[PDB]
Each structure stands twice: as C-alpha cells, then as structure tokens.
Amino acid sequence: WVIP
Amino acid sequence: WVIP
Amino acid sequence: DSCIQFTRHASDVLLNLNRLRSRDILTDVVIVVSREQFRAHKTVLMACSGLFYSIFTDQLKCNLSVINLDPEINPEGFCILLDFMYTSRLNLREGNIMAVMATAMYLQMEHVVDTCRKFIKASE
Amino acid sequence: DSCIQFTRHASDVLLNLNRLRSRDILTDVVIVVSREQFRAHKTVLMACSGLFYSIFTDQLKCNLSVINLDPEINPEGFCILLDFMYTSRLNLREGNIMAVMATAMYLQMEHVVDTCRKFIKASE
Numbered sequence: 001w002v003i004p
Numbered sequence: 005w006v007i008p
Numbered sequence: 009d010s011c012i013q014f015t016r017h018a019s020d021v022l023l024n025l026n027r028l029r030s031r032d033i034l035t036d037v038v039i040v041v042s043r044e045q046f047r048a049h050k051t052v053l054m055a056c057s058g059l060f061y062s063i064f065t066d067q068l069k070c071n072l073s074v075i076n077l078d079p080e081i082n083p084e085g086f087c088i089l090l091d092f093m094y095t096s097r098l099n100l101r102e103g104n105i106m107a108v109m110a111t112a113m114y115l116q117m118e119h120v121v122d123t124c125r126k127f128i129k130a131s132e
Numbered sequence: 133d134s135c136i137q138f139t140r141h142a143s144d145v146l147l148n149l150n151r152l153r154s155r156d157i158l159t160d161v162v163i164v165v166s167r168e169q170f171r172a173h174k175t176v177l178m179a180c181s182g183l184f185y186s187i188f189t190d191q192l193k194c195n196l197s198v199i200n201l202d203p204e205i206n207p208e209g210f211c212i213l214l215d216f217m218y219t220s221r222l223n224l225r226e227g228n229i230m231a232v233m234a235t236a237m238y239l240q241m242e243h244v245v246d247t248c249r250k251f252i253k254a255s256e
C-alpha cells in the first residue's frame with residue numbers, strides 16, 4: 001500500500 | 005515497454 | 009518466453025472497466041445492500057473478492073441478476089470497497105475503518121483486511 | 133482525496149480475468165477469425181481495443197454472441213493480441229511482427245501499433  |  | 013510487457017496495461021484496463029461502470033455499460037448484476045443497489049460487472053467482482061468468485065462460479069447463482077448481501081453489511085463500507093475494486097484506491101478513514109474491515113472480511117478481500125488490521129493496530 | 137493505493141491491484145485483477153478466460157468462465161462472446169474461434173469477455177475486449185469498444189457500445193451489436201472479423205485478419209496475430217489484452221505481455225517476433233501490427237491497427241490498439249512501428253524501424 002502507498003500514498004498515490 | 006520493458007523486458008519482464 | 010521472449011515477450012515484451014507494457015507496464016501501464018493492467019492500470020489502463022482497470023481505468024477503462026471503471027469508465028464502463030460509471031456509464032452503466034455491460035453491467036450484468038445488481039448487488040443489494042439493505043436499501044441500496046450497486047450495479048457492477050460479475051467478472052470484476054470475481055477478480056477482487058473470494059465471496060463473489062464462489063457465488064458466480066456456482067452453477068445456479070452464476071445466472072442471477074440480483075445478489076442480496078447479509079443485512080449486517082453496511083452500504084457505505086460496500087461502496088468504498090466497490091470503488092477500490094475498480095480503481096485500486098481505498099478511502100480508509102477513522103470513521104469508516106470498522107465497517108470497511110467487516111465488509112472486506114465478508115467479501116474475502118485479504119489485502120484490504122490486512123491494511124485495516126495494521127491501521128487499527130497503529131491507533132491502539 | 134486521502135485514499136491509499138494497493139500497487140499490485142490492477143495486475144492481480146488482470147491475472148484473475150485471465151484465469152477466468154483459461155477456464156472459460158463467464159466468457160460472453162466468440163470472436164471468429166477465418167476458421168478459428170476465440171472465446172473472451174466483452175468488457176476486457178472493450179477495455180483493450182478501440183474497435184471492440186465501438187462494437188459493444190452499439191445498441192444492436194452489444195447483444196451479439198458471435199463477432200466475425202475481416203477475412204484479411206490473421207488468426208495467429210489475433211491470438212497474440214488476445215493474450216496481450218489479458219496479460220500485458222506481447223509475443224512479438226520477426227516472423228509475426230507484420231501480422232501483429234496489421235491486427236493491432238484494425239483492433240485500434242495504439243500502444244501495440246507504436247512498439248511494432250519502432251521494432252520495424254530498428255530492423256531497416
């Protein structure tokens with residue numbers, strides 16, 4: 001999971 | 005396009 | 009093999025599937041969550057959820073145009089997860105994390121369940 | 133928004149759509165290319181090809197279970213492109229590049245046309  |  | 013790969017292809021396909029959902033094109037099922045209705049593509053639901061995979065591979069249920077979810081399922085939690093299925097983006101907030109995790113457990117969406125459990129562990 | 137994103141989601145969705153294709157699950161159309169037949173999902177074809185997008189948004193053609201391609205279309209070229217649609221991998225070889233490019237132009241698959249043109253320019 002990432003900060004888009 | 006890339007070499008997978 | 010000696011194949012080449014187009015890095016953005018999977019992302020572009022999903023973006024187009026979401027455009028079809030937005031315009032209600034070739035949607036083939038309605039998911040009923042209490043008083044709310046959500047139109048979607050059976051194949052996309054199956055590709056994202058262990059529960060929908062089991063439902064639409066069933067010889068009788070594969071032909072249903074309406075699926076009713078368990079009444080304990082929250083429509084907002086479902087809406088957030090349906091958006092995630094079609095975009096890879098999860099709108100996880102303090103106010104919705106419990107409903108989202110409960111819905112992801114029911115839908116059998118393991119990666120969503122995992123991030124919810126981690127975000128909950130961080131706030132305790 | 134304040135969304136989080138699961139990097140591998142689009143790739144995982146496409147991998148699952150390809151598993152459904154391999155097991156012939158919920159395929160809803162046959163594409164006829166000369167003596168050959170290819171089963172597929174209308175939504176995936178539309179998401180990858182400008183030609184299938186135009187075909188299945190047509191109010192009459194959207195309901196057809198069989199689509200016949202132009203007789204000039206090579207079945208191997210189509211097979212290679214259908215595999216690309218469901219995997220992001222293109223099996224481009226000296227022996228098939230001309231058929232693949234001609235098929236991608238007909239199917240309106242711009243990124244495939246672009247790489248074919250570049251590979252052809254390099255060999256001249």
Ligand SMILES: O=C1Cc2cc(Nc3nc(Cl)ncc3Br)ccc2N1
Nearest residue numbers: 054055056057058116117118148151
């Ligand atoms: O957390 C998750 C997400 C998910 C998706 C599917 N979908 C499919 N799985 C397989 Cl093996 N083949 C085709 C399809 Br469609 C099955 C289980 C799960 N569990």
Ligand SMILES: O=C1Cc2cc(Nc3nc(Cl)ncc3Br)ccc2N1
Nearest residue numbers: 024027178179180181182240241242
């Ligand atoms: O080279 C390409 C690939 C492709 C795909 C689509 N598909 C869609 N396009 C739009 Cl805008 N909305 C929904 C869908 Br499905 C249209 C044109 C093209 N040209």
Ligand SMILES: [Cl-]
Nearest residue numbers: 117118119120
């Ligand atoms: Cl997931």
Ligand SMILES: [Cl-]
Nearest residue numbers: 241242243244
């Ligand atoms: Cl393309």
